[PDB]
Design an enzyme around this catalytic site. Structure first.
Site, PDB file in Angstrom:
ATOM      1  N   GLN A 100       0.851  -1.191   0.000  1.00  0.00           N
ATOM      2  CA  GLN A 100       0.000   0.000   0.000  1.00  0.00           C
ATOM      3  C   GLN A 100       0.884   1.237   0.000  1.00  0.00           C
ATOM      4  O   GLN A 100       1.487   1.585   1.019  1.00  0.00           O
ATOM      5  CB  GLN A 100      -0.937   0.062   1.216  1.00  0.00           C
ATOM      6  CG  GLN A 100      -1.874   1.281   1.111  1.00  0.00           C
ATOM      7  CD  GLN A 100      -2.738   1.511   2.331  1.00  0.00           C
ATOM      8  OE1 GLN A 100      -2.234   1.747   3.431  1.00  0.00           O
ATOM      9  NE2 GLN A 100      -4.054   1.461   2.135  1.00  0.00           N
ATOM     10  N   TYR A 186      -6.004  10.771   3.958  1.00  0.00           N
ATOM     11  CA  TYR A 186      -4.624  11.071   3.636  1.00  0.00           C
ATOM     12  C   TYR A 186      -4.463  11.972   2.411  1.00  0.00           C
ATOM     13  O   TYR A 186      -5.449  12.548   1.953  1.00  0.00           O
ATOM     14  CB  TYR A 186      -3.821   9.773   3.586  1.00  0.00           C
ATOM     15  CG  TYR A 186      -3.792   9.157   4.970  1.00  0.00           C
ATOM     16  CD1 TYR A 186      -4.469   7.968   5.245  1.00  0.00           C
ATOM     17  CD2 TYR A 186      -3.165   9.814   6.033  1.00  0.00           C
ATOM     18  CE1 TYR A 186      -4.529   7.458   6.537  1.00  0.00           C
ATOM     19  CE2 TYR A 186      -3.217   9.307   7.333  1.00  0.00           C
ATOM     20  CZ  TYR A 186      -3.906   8.125   7.579  1.00  0.00           C
ATOM     21  OH  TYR A 186      -3.996   7.634   8.869  1.00  0.00           O
ATOM     22  N   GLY A 322      -9.863  -6.678   9.246  1.00  0.00           N
ATOM     23  CA  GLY A 322      -8.680  -6.059   9.815  1.00  0.00           C
ATOM     24  C   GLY A 322      -8.341  -6.495  11.222  1.00  0.00           C
ATOM     25  O   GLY A 322      -7.493  -7.357  11.433  1.00  0.00           O
ATOM     26  N   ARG A 323      -9.013  -5.896  12.194  1.00  0.00           N
ATOM     27  CA  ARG A 323      -8.741  -6.232  13.577  1.00  0.00           C
ATOM     28  C   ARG A 323      -8.793  -7.731  13.851  1.00  0.00           C
ATOM     29  O   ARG A 323      -7.952  -8.252  14.591  1.00  0.00           O
ATOM     30  CB  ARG A 323      -9.663  -5.413  14.476  1.00  0.00           C
ATOM     31  CG  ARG A 323      -9.161  -3.964  14.512  1.00  0.00           C
ATOM     32  CD  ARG A 323     -10.182  -2.943  14.991  1.00  0.00           C
ATOM     33  NE  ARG A 323     -11.169  -2.627  13.962  1.00  0.00           N
ATOM     34  CZ  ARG A 323     -12.059  -1.645  14.064  1.00  0.00           C
ATOM     35  NH1 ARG A 323     -12.082  -0.881  15.153  1.00  0.00           N
ATOM     36  NH2 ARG A 323     -12.925  -1.421  13.079  1.00  0.00           N
TER      37      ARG A 323
HETATM   38  C1  LIG Z   1      -3.827  -1.092  13.824  1.00  0.00           C
HETATM   39  C2  LIG Z   1      -4.545  -0.504  12.621  1.00  0.00           C
HETATM   40  C3  LIG Z   1      -3.720   0.126  11.615  1.00  0.00           C
HETATM   41  C4  LIG Z   1      -4.399   0.412  10.278  1.00  0.00           C
HETATM   42  N1  LIG Z   1      -3.572   0.939   9.327  1.00  0.00           N
HETATM   43  C5  LIG Z   1      -4.073   1.024   8.062  1.00  0.00           C
HETATM   44  C6  LIG Z   1      -3.227   1.209   6.797  1.00  0.00           C
HETATM   45  O1  LIG Z   1      -1.903   1.492   7.114  1.00  0.00           O
HETATM   46  N2  LIG Z   1      -3.840   1.718   5.709  1.00  0.00           N
HETATM   47  C7  LIG Z   1      -5.236   1.609   5.447  1.00  0.00           C
HETATM   48  O2  LIG Z   1      -5.670   1.856   4.368  1.00  0.00           O
HETATM   49  N3  LIG Z   1      -6.068   1.285   6.545  1.00  0.00           N
HETATM   50  C8  LIG Z   1      -5.532   0.915   7.700  1.00  0.00           C
HETATM   51  N4  LIG Z   1      -6.324   0.485   8.747  1.00  0.00           N
HETATM   52  C9  LIG Z   1      -7.756   0.297   8.445  1.00  0.00           C
HETATM   53  C10 LIG Z   1      -7.982  -1.178   8.104  1.00  0.00           C
HETATM   54  O3  LIG Z   1      -7.379  -1.551   6.869  1.00  0.00           O
HETATM   55  C11 LIG Z   1      -9.485  -1.502   8.052  1.00  0.00           C
HETATM   56  O4  LIG Z   1     -10.107  -0.798   6.946  1.00  0.00           O
HETATM   57  C12 LIG Z   1     -10.261  -1.234   9.323  1.00  0.00           C
HETATM   58  O5  LIG Z   1      -9.561  -1.774  10.473  1.00  0.00           O
HETATM   59  C13 LIG Z   1     -11.704  -1.681   9.325  1.00  0.00           C
HETATM   60  O6  LIG Z   1     -11.798  -3.114   9.249  1.00  0.00           O
HETATM   61  P1  LIG Z   1     -12.052  -4.006  10.555  1.00  0.00           P
HETATM   62  O7  LIG Z   1     -13.308  -3.521  11.218  1.00  0.00           O
HETATM   63  O8  LIG Z   1     -12.262  -5.431   9.955  1.00  0.00           O
HETATM   64  O9  LIG Z   1     -10.840  -3.921  11.422  1.00  0.00           O
HETATM   65  C14 LIG Z   1      -5.841   0.196  10.076  1.00  0.00           C
HETATM   66  C15 LIG Z   1      -6.560  -0.556  11.197  1.00  0.00           C
HETATM   67  C16 LIG Z   1      -5.882  -0.969  12.386  1.00  0.00           C
HETATM   68  C17 LIG Z   1      -6.946  -1.649  13.289  1.00  0.00           C
HETATM   69  C1  LIG Z   2      -1.912   4.516  12.209  1.00  0.00           C
HETATM   70  C2  LIG Z   2      -3.319   4.235  11.682  1.00  0.00           C
HETATM   71  O1  LIG Z   2      -4.226   4.026  12.748  1.00  0.00           O
HETATM   72  C3  LIG Z   2      -4.009   4.159  10.430  1.00  0.00           C
HETATM   73  C4  LIG Z   2      -5.384   3.975  10.171  1.00  0.00           C
HETATM   74  C5  LIG Z   2      -6.020   4.105   8.933  1.00  0.00           C
HETATM   75  C6  LIG Z   2      -5.002   4.382   7.791  1.00  0.00           C
HETATM   76  O2  LIG Z   2      -5.654   4.378   6.617  1.00  0.00           O
HETATM   77  C7  LIG Z   2      -3.617   4.467   7.992  1.00  0.00           C
HETATM   78  C8  LIG Z   2      -3.172   4.366   9.317  1.00  0.00           C
END
Ligand SMILES: Cc1cc2nc3c(=O)[nH]c(=O)nc-3n(C[C@H](O)[C@H](O)[C@H](O)COP(=O)(O)O)c2cc1C
Ligand SMILES: CC(=O)c1ccc(O)cc1
Ligand SMILES: CCCCCCCCO[C@@H]1O[C@H](CO)[C@@H](O)[C@H](O)[C@H]1O
Length: 365
Positions: A100, A186, A322-323
């Site tokens: 990414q 972003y 994600g989580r």
């Molecule tokens: C620890 C953390 C860091 C994340 N960092 C990014 C990432 O670097 N870029 C991005 O597009 N989204 C990022 N996300 C968002 C996740 O890709 C995802 O869209 C989001 O957690 C929702 O999905 P979930 O409910 O299944 O966790 C982050 C989520 C967590 C929980």
């Molecule tokens: C550091 C972070 O929580 C995070 C969350 C969503 C993003 O799209 C990129 C980074």
């Protein structure tokens, strides 16, 4: 019951094992100095290679594209080599992985970009937003973001060049493709959303103008590595990091159609960001399904039932978790069997070492 979720799918020249995606997740574990991807990260991703597709955590395309402490870069030779350890580990397990490409724009602090002032579409500061920096300890130090300076024509050309090279760098690192982070408030999102863009030039003022930067960056990425290796992430309705659009249905349906013209291999919609989970009308999802006809991925509070339903209703082709993937390296197996899911520990999401990263066990009855 997850039958469709466990059907394979073609992604460009690749065939994926199932419809499950490990979405990009910043873990801020990059080696210092140099922000280099490393051994523990390679183990971390390889442990989760049962996913159909892994999208790497955001990786900055340049020194000033970084927004959080210890995130891995993808612009130096050592950074490319570090990512190579990761892609070799993942490929050894049989899984596709996309990098990414990240530029945070105004969502950063001078401490994370060599004391420089952040750049954005405009001089608008992200309201009520914090990032974290390194403060002489191994614990994330949260700080308020800084006021950005508006990008000049030269800055735009530079960032596009940085994205283009980062894509080549990702291929040199062994990635199967790249995902353009144009979501979650972003840099590119700062141009797309009307309330974050007050430019009076060709990059603001009209819907066509607001999508121009996205258009030009994607054109460069496709030119560099091929449309079949380019995916893009968008966040139509979340506003957590300060970007709000006045008419998101129009803006994002248009964006989806624009990306469809570029023939990008997949469009990834970030439906939820942390606890920001806005109602996302099925009617809107169906419109996106017609506007963009490649592989459509959604992520945000999905469980096995909702993921299967989204695919069976014709709304999505793949679903990211994600989580749940943080705490369950064998998430796919658990979803298929209905095994209980471990929950992640917020305290170890960012920074530190293997604890809270590679020590979440696989399921054992
Ligand atoms: C620890 C953390 C860091 C994340 N960092 C990014 C990432 O670097 N870029 C991005 O597009 N989204 C990022 N996300 C968002 C996740 O890709 C995802 O869209 C989001 O957690 C929702 O999905 P979930 O409910 O299944 O966790 C982050 C989520 C967590 C929980
Ligand atoms: C550091 C972070 O929580 C995070 C969350 C969503 C993003 O799209 C990129 C980074
Ligand atoms: C064929 C089996 C190959 C196993 C390769 C394991 C490579 C482990 O590599 C090790 O990872 C550790 C973190 O987990 C780091 O702290 C060490 O410095 C690193 O050498």
């Amino acid at each position: 019951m997850t039958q469709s979720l466990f059907q394979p799918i073609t992604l460009g020249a690749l065939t994926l094992k199932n419809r499950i995606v490990m979405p990009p997740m910043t873990r801020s574990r990059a080696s210092q100095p140099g922000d280099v991807a490393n051994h523990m990260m390679a183990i971390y991703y390889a442990q989760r290679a049962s996913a159909g597709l892994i999208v790497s955590e955001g990786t900055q395309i340049s020194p000033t594209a970084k927004g959080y402490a210890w995130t891995p870069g993808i612009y130096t030779p050592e950074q490319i080599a570090g990512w190579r350890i990761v892609t070799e580990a993942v490929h050894a397990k049989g899984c596709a992985i996309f990098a990414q490409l990240w530029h945070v724009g105004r969502v950063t602090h001078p401490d994370n970009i060599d004391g420089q002032q952040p750049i954005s579409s405009s001089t608008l500061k992200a309201e009520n937003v914090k990032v974290f920096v390194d403060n002489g300890s191994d614990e994330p130090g949260f700080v308020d973001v800084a006021v950005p300076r508006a990008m000049t024509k030269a800055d735009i050309a530079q960032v596009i060049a940085d994205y283009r090279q980062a894509a080549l760098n990702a291929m040199e690192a062994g990635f199967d493709g790249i995902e353009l982070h144009a979501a979650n408030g972003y840099l590119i999102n700062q141009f797309i959303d009307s309330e974050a863009n007050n430019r009076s030039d060709e990059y603001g003022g009209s819907l066509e103008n607001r999508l121009r930067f996205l258009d030009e960056v994607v054109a460069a990425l496709v030119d560099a590595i091929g449309a079949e290796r380019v995916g893009v992430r968008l966040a139509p309705l979340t506003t957590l990091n300060g970007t709000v659009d006045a008419d998101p249905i129009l803006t994002y349906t248009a964006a989806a159609a624009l990306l469809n013209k570029h023939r990008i291999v997949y469009l990834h919609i970030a439906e939820v960001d942390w606890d920001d989970a806005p109602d996302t009308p099925v009617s809107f999802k169906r419109a996106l399904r017609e506007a963009y006809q490649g592989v459509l991925i959604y992520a945000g509070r999905y469980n096995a039932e909702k993921a299967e339903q989204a695919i069976n209703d014709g709304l999505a082709d793949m679903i990211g978790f994600g989580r749940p993937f943080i705490a369950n390296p064998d998430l796919p197996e658990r979803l298929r069997h209905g095994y209980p899911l471990a929950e992640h520990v917020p305290a170890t999401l960012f920074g530190g070492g293997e604890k809270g990263l590679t020590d979440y066990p696989t399921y054992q009855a």
